Symmetry: D2
Subunit: 400 residues, 4 copies
């Protein structure tokens, strides 16, 4: 229970200052260094390599706990583990032996530069052109690069260009954020998630060496199309997002409840003597706490299944498909829950909870409302419907 | 897995005939006898006493499976385990050493006569008059006596009367359904749950012998008041109801999807070519399938905790209260899900699914609409809200 | 107020017997004759021609009031006016001069035979083949022929075949229901709307004469595509459906309230002394009555606009499209309301309202759930959204 | 039509600057002066007295129009008419003969100081101490004094103290905001409604002269208890709030639609090519636009009834109660609509609508979420339920 106690203490510390920090935006450097000092960035690194030797259920619980205190830090922490998962699923034994002890000693906090701001999510224009001796050169701009500021290593994706062994192949690499030609742009000014540093990143002639490549170019496409073990990356990552939404939900419900207990006035016009005994206040808390209990219990079960399949040598298409359906279902339910709860709970607190902007309760809705648009919930709903009605598992990809 | 395989095969046979049987109402004797021959009524009896020595997770899964095929049979089966749970929590070791091998040998299917139709659910008027030899005489009429027809034993509740040691004290007993003076009235004629035989039972001078009594007078009240282990009866039973709702929900979704694949016509007016590719059909299946996956996953966690506390020698009010809150939340979510989907799934099927009465899909809504009224979900919502906001566990009762 | 008083009195009488009549299904001949005697079938015929010279707001109010007592009689009554509206929009001056006094004298109650059960709703295969002197012969089977039993005249639609003047043109005619070769099949057996007689009708060599044709073959296609005055038929008819749903909603709300005042028990476990003072019972009635008040007030405005445009010589595409959008909006809101309310009101009444099948409250949900599937509400929603987002009015058709 | 054209033009100009102005908060002096110059503040003053002699339907439509551009200015404009309505309902004919020509000539924009921040609403501590001449000395601080800054007159409420003719009676008056001892505090820093100046006002020995008093002490209480014409103030004012919510809803829908047409990217992962043709985007717009059409149509009818009763010399409790129920119903529907729509419309726009804080669409949710808490919608729901189920009209008060 030690790692979770560490995460709980981190979250308590983050609650004290999140109101003022999130207003200013920018990089939460002091808090990222506290996470570095905590050791939790090493949860999934084996003890033999210097890490904590912990499991995915612990990682998910820590993500939700931190997210309940500070959604931007929960996002950054969770995305670190999405990046780590990708690295771990493709790294060679040589790379793990070098990188993981280094990640412990240098306290790596991983960032990524993957998505782009073109015509659609599939229009990728960051290229990797081959160099002598097996290196590549990266050129172009990436968007929504969560945790790219103050990241020690960047997980980067590019498409092979002018490549004699095949253009259009997806290359992934793990490079130092201070490699020449890498420019983090710090242009993140959002409604919520205001400290995630999810702005754009530009690559000018950036060299990637062979010992930084995560598999051969195109290997990710083969692993996903085949259902190899790396196809677990998408359910793992979407369950990370699910735990952000559940953490935000619980944080909002608990903060509202503290307000109601200490500050809400009874509607004596209707004969109520105490706001905490009002039947409609109690009904609001009961409706949302009930949905949260069921969603949290369901999320714990799916997290245990993530761990189970993580440990297998091979995951069948049925096992991976079933997991992806369970994860998508959890994310759908958590998305609806957090969006509704963070808005409707004002009705349990009363007008003064909005009349003083500084109370800051709208941070929960602003964070949830921003992040949940990460990928459209309508098409997660369509994928679950296509599975149930047509017996079609989602196609493994970066989004399903 | 053997036990769940047997339940799955039972459910398959019940699906073949449920549409015809439930119209008639009345007692599903052949199907009750099939359940008797299956051995599953002995799921929770230890192997040492001739039973299967299985766990509550298996019982709850079996309940949902059967209920997905025939909600009345799922109800009869589930209430048998509610009755069994009461006996197990209150009978002496000496009584259980006699009753349980007899229940196995005689293939006992339990019913109950407990609630009444007076001014409100607390108002009980069926009396137990003490006789000099330690026996009691029972007089009065009970309502909603599920499984009272064809029952090998009835779990019966009465309040003491003409009692020098105190009137109004609740006594419970397990008695043969054909004991002199017991009249099963056969007046069950309901919207849904049409074969549960939940009619009235009239007791005329019915003798109860000392070795048929479950505890002492008022003992159930004392156990409720102290939140001790016998008060687990309520979360156990409320979780039985939850699994009826999850089972009905799954059955309705599967039956609707079969119609959507086989008979629904594409809305060509809007350019649709296949109903199974219609975006709004797919969204209905996705939304409800997603909520069902999360609810079923959370329900499995709560069932594991039921088993945990069932095996304990002592249970504290905090353990019992936390379990009751988790059960209540599961019941709330399942109630809303089943009531919504059994009505809205018609929109995924089309007009002819209702215009052809013989299709009989309305059975799912009728069954769920009837059963979910067992006790008011508004007060399960209040109970979860009072816990979350005011840190007050539900007051243990026959309902909470 | 005379006409509305007559409809109110009719509805009063229908309420006495609807519970018994709709169980049996079949043709409500006695009630149809009571409507004939009332004169209300002539509401839209000018006094000059022997009718009442009333307005569409009166028709719509009468439809909703009758539907609140008996949805099948409300449906038959309303569809009579959809049939009359089609006739009035396409009939020649000499057809009106002959038919309308005859409809008054003979107390005509109209039915129709229009839709079919082929691959999709566009797919019409009942043929009209030329005969000498401009007559046509009709062959094939129609489905969903509301009011086709006991009909004085049938509005029938067919597609021309082996026609020198052009194949595949839609022809419409108003013919006697007992003409040789017309076989009303009497096969309506529905979940709800059980006395609308909406079964199939088979046409074997049925002769239609030129003086029974409603415009030339294909004229309806041209009138809808061009937005000439007959394009009002669809918003008129969809608003008829809307008033069926509002009528059912009001009838259900009022019937539930009577049960709650008379029979519901207080939940004394939570300290409630009277069910009519329960905060959650009150919230259910308040939610649904509030939405009903708004929906009804909105529907009055749209019905007035129907009358205003009905009196216009020419209606622009803006005026027709805005009306169709207002009608579709009213129908969407009414559909959601009646489907939710007819199911959720059980929670304000209690278990015994469902456990005693004879109470028959489920008739409201059965009727509403059946009729609201007439055409898919998802595509009414799309039509309103296409208008608001893209400024595209719905393409006029039999559906929009 | 001229007045509404003027309001539409005002709203056009407000939309240009609202994003920048509402961020700063404070007093929108230039825009208040634009409203002064428009003459619309005199809409309800008779032409005889120099006003526009217009109707409440015109006022309500102008309130919604302005609120759709700038919710704070719509609120200020709307509350001006609430203040005016109170004056008209309680002022003597002689008072109006002086005040209304002055309000025209001096372009009065009214504010109020009425509510307070004590243990519960209606727990009032601002006192009125009688002076020998019939004046009152006012002492205390008022809360939520909308429009208190830059107000030409304040409508003020106090409770009598040290009063031989009875303590605790409510007095009301209309006084200059620069009367000696009046301090408008400017302490308003809110989530939304950021330019309504709803801070506190402190009265230090403020003398109120006899010709400024509105009625006699406790007359407002007696009017409420009688349900007589002056108690129309509450339904009038609650319908003002309703039109704020309908205006915010319409403004949010149109602003979102503009973004969707201009900036939303199609989700090619699913094969869609234009965001404005996405089936789920279209469903969101259609669902909310449909609900909005019906709500707006219904609100127009209730506004016509406000005008009817406003022109009567006497109003019965039944007429007032029926109107209050209709107003409560409109408020309930509008509240639910605006709160859902201002949050869910992000799903129709996509992530970049929230990633760019400066888009500023969250203003609609912040404004609606703040104002809808004015009084709890849960008790409007109970009030409508108590009327429908128990035939009890709402108890007249400042809130019902
Ligand atoms: C708060 C937030 C954080 C995001 N973080 C990442 C990220 O770390 N890596 C990535 O590839 N995309 C990230 N995305 C991008 C989304 O996956 C997606 O590309 C984007 O939301 C599409 O925007 P649209 O809906 O306007 O088309 C993020 C998006 C949001 C809103
Ligand atoms: C934006 C806003 C403006 C308000 N303006 C006024 C006002 O002008 N006059 C008034 O008496 N109350 C005003 N109120 C207050 C309500 O009457 C009520 O006192 C308050 O909303 C209750 O606060 P609570 O729910 O936190 O207990 C306003 C409230 C809000 C939220
Ligand atoms: C109760 C009911 C009555 C109907 N009455 C008629 C009718 O009178 N004339 C007609 O053309 N269609 C009628 N329809 C049919 C619709 O036009 C449409 O063909 C049908 O609902 C589509 O069926 P589907 O959703 O199963 O494909 C009726 C449908 C229902 C449910
Ligand atoms: C389908 C159904 C089955 C029921 N079976 C039982 C039962 O077996 N034993 C029992 O004590 N109560 C049973 N109940 C009754 C509830 O405990 C409760 O008394 C009843 O639902 C309250 O009815 P009311 O809401 O109309 O007041 C049953 C209720 C329903 C609806
Ligand atoms: C109140 C009292 C006893 C019981 C209920 C409600 S449901 C049920 C099911 C089985 C056995 C007893 C009881
Ligand atoms: C397609 C074509 C004709 C008709 C429908 C659908 S519903 C209806 C109701 C009355 C008369 C004609 C029609
Ligand atoms: C309680 C008492 C007075 C008032 C409210 C609530 S809102 C409002 C708006 C304008 C004028 C007076 C009041």
């Amino acid at each position: 229970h030690r790692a979770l106690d560490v995460a709980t203490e981190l979250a308590k510390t983050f609650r004290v200052t999140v109101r003022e920090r999130e207003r200013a935006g920018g990089t939460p450097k002091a808090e990222r260094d506290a996470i570095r000092r905590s050791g939790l960035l090493t949860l999934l690194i084996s003890k033999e390599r210097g890490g904590l030797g912990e499991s995915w259920p612990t990682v998910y619980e820590a993500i939700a706990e931190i997210a309940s205190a500070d959604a931007s830090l929960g996002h950054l922490f969770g995305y670190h583990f999405s990046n780590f998962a990708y690295v771990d699923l493709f790294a060679s034994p040589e790379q793990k032996a070098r990188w993981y002890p280094q990640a412990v000693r240098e306290r790596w906090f991983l960032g990524n530069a993957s998505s782009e701001n073109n015509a659609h999510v599939l229009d990728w224009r960051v290229t990797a052109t081959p160099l002598p001796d097996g290196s590549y050169e990266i050129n172009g701009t990436k968007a929504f690069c969560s945790g790219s500021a103050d990241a020690d290593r960047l997980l980067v994706f590019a498409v092979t260009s002018r490549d004699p062994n095949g253009d259009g192949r997806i290359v992934a690499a793990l490079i130092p954020s201070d490699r020449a030609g890498v420019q983090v742009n710090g242009d993140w000014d959002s409604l919520g998630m205001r400290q995630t540093d999810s702005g754009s990143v530009t690559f000018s002639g950036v060299v990637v060496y062979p010992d930084e490549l995560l598999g051969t170019p195109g290997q990710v496409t083969d692993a996903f199309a085949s259902g190899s073990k790396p196809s677990l990356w998408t359910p793992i990552t979407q369950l990370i997002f699910t735990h952000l939404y559940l953490g935000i939900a619980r944080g909002a419900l608990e903060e509202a409840a503290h307000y109601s207990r200490s500050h809400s006035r009874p509607f004596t016009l209707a004969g109520v003597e105490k706001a905490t005994e009002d039947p409609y206040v109690l009904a609001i808390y009961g409706e949302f706490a009930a949905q949260l209990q069921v969603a949290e219990a369901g999320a714990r079960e799916v997290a245990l299944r993530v761990q189970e399949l993580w440990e297998r040598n091979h995951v069948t298409p049925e096992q991976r498909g079933q997991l992806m359906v369970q994860v998508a279902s959890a994310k759908i339910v958590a998305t609806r829950l957090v969006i509704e709860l963070t808005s409707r709970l004002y009705e349990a607190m009363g007008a003064r909870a909005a009349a003083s902007r500084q109370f800051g309760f709208d941070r929960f809705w602003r964070d949830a409302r921003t992040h949940t648009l990460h990928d459209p919930v309508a098409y997660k709903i369509r994928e679950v419907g296509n599975w149930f009605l047509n017996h079609r598992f989602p196609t493994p990809s970066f989004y399903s």
